[PDB]
């Protein structure tokens, strides 16, 4: 890459398909998840805050608690364990 900021090369993954453009439905931004639950991580282009590092888009982690209204989700980046702080708006239950 020519630069190394957090959004380097995120044109596609952080862009909305035209029809999904615009403020997102509040339901998923308020969804509640329980510890142990499997949740897919996917940033919602329309939602500014509560995001995780774009590099983690597509991970399926495990909720292990929360910090304020955000969730602490455990993942394994390659071989290393990491805890991700992320709000419901960027999460989806697995299955």
């Amino acid at each position: 890459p020519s630069s190394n900021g957090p959004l380097e090369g995120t044109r596609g993954k952080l862009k909305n398909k035209p029809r999904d453009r615009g403020t997102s439905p509040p339901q998923r931004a308020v969804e509640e998840f329980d510890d142990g639950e499997k949740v897919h991580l996917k940033i919602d282009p329309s939602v500014p805050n509560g995001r995780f590092h774009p590099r983690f888009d597509g991970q399926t982690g495990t909720v292990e608690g929360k910090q304020g209204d955000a969730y602490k989700v455990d993942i394994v980046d390659g071989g290393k364990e990491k805890t991700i702080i992320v709000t419901a708006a960027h999460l989806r239950r697995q299955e």
Partner: protein
């Protein structure tokens, strides 16, 4: 409508019925919502909770079923609104609901209005709802005094159908008196 790339607003947005930005902020409380609404002739109060396939109304009261307890007056005024809230509130307490946040939909936060009267009603019913006293109409107006004095400037009865000539806020009292009572069939 124009083409593949065209963006159509969410249905409740087209219909101009749901303010999604206010809704989200409302839902962030984690508490149920005291949905206060109005019609030209009626006033409705619902205690709504979030659900998997949509909202869930746990309790509610309409100004119409107010007569069901001895109401012969119109159903689109302050006294009606307050009592309707209280009724809904009481029923809310029945179903186990103890707290709520006022959702006034697309209505304006005008001081002394009816959605605020509905709130004062629901609060007296025993429901804990974040509010602000100096935004609620003064007691007398809730009773319906403002309308009695309006009938003072008579010459021609304010109410077409005969409910009375000089109207009665004292009736408001009898009804609230009846609602705060235990017996009452909710």
């Amino acid at each position: 409508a124009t083409g593949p790339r065209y963006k159509v607003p969410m249905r409740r947005r087209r219909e101009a019925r749901t303010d999604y930005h206010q809704r989200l902020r409302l839902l962030k409380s984690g508490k149920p919502r005291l949905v206060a609404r109005k019609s030209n002739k009626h006033v409705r109060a619902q205690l709504v909770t979030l659900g998997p396939n949509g909202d869930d109304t746990l309790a509610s009261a309409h100004s119409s079923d107010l007569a069901e307890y001895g109401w012969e007056a119109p159903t689109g005024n302050m006294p009606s609104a307050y009592l309707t809230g209280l009724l809904a509130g009481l029923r809310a307490q029945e179903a186990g609901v103890e707290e709520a946040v006022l959702d006034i939909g697309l209505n304006s936060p005008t001081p002394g209005s009816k959605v605020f009267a509905i709130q004062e009603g629901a609060i007296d019913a025993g429901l804990d709802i974040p509010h602000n006293d100096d935004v609620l109409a003064d007691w007398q107006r809730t009773r319906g005094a403002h309308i009695a004095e309006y009938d003072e400037q008579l010459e021609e009865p304010l109410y077409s159908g005969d409910f009375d000539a000089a109207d009665l806020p004292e009736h408001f009292d009898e009804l609230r008196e009846t609602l705060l009572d235990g017996d009452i069939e909710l």
